[PDB]
Amino acid sequence: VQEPVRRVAHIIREYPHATNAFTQGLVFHQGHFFESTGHQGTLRQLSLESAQPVWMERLGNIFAEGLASDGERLYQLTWTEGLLFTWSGMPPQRERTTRYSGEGWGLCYWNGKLVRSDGGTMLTFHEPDGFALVGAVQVKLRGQPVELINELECANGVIYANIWHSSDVLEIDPATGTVVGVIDASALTRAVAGQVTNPEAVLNGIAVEPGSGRIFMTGKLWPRLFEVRLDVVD
Ligand SMILES: CCCCCCCCCC[N+](C)(C)[O-]
Numbered sequence: 001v002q003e004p005v006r007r008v009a010h011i012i013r014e015y016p017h018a019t020n021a022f023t024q025g026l027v028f029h030q031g032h033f034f035e036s037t038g039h040q041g042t043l044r045q046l047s048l049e050s051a052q053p054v055w056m057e058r059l060g061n062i063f064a065e066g067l068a069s070d071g072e073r074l075y076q077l078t079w080t081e082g083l084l085f086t087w088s089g090m091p092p093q094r095e096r097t098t099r100y101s102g103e104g105w106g107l108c109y110w111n112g113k114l115v116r117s118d119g120g121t122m123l124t125f126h127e128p129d130g131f132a133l134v135g136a137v138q139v140k141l142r143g144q145p146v147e148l149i150n151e152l153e154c155a156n157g158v159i160y161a162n163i164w165h166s167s168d169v170l171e172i173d174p175a176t177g178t179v180v181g182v183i184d185a186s187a188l189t190r191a192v193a194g195q196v197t198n199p200e201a202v203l204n205g206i207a208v209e210p211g212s213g214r215i216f217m218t219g220k221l222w223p224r225l226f227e228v229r230l231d232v233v234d
């Protein structure tokens with residue numbers, strides 16, 4: 001038991017993002033870059049050369065939320081609807097609708113399981129086929145539960161998680177819920193501050209590219225998505 005590692009996200013490069021996209025899910029999938037939005041609900045494939053998506057399916061009034069990939073299918077939560085959409089093929093088409101209890105904030109895939117956050121302190125673990133709960137951990141930083149756990153990303157042996165309305169990103173051990181790292185991504189929030197006005201225009205959305213290990217972060221309604229390098233601070 002030691003101090004969580006402290007890191008600072010250093011902006012490597014910036015790319016256009018759409019200022020009308022409320023980013024709730026962000027993941028790489030079968031060579032492409034995907035985003036889930038609510039208000040209005042969409043699944044979109046992003047270009048890094050333009051804010052205009054290369055492909056989008058509109059979900060109407062459904063408030064879509066976190067988005068996970070197992071390499072073959074995309075899995076997409078909803079906020080209070082209790083709907084999980086499972087997408088397959090290229091372009092993705094929905095092949096399954098699944099009802100679940102509780103709220104859907106972030107989602108990622110780890111060790112054959114979907115890991116789900118709901119804005120509380122808990123990460124719950126679910127079977128991809130039918131979304132039955134199989135386990136849970138409480139997310140704890142220095143032994144203390146952390147509320148507001150939002151978009152997820154399963155990479156590098158951890159779960160990366162946004163904290164809603166914070167510029168910190170946690171690194172969580174999925175076996176235990178222990179926070180093993182805290183990333184300061186406040187340079188990203190500072191970077192867009194002169195351009196965003198909406199109260200909900202907050203850092204959210206982490207995706208790691210499988211083929212390159214390159215790490216990307218954005219925010220709701222942000223004009224930019226950022227590639228970051230995570231530097232240890234001592
Ligand atoms: C112009 C007003 C925009 C209202 C936005 C409401 C965002 C709800 C976000 C919920 N969650 C944290 C669950 O996504």
Ligand SMILES: [Ca+2]
Nearest residue numbers: 026152153206
């Ligand atoms: Ca993600």
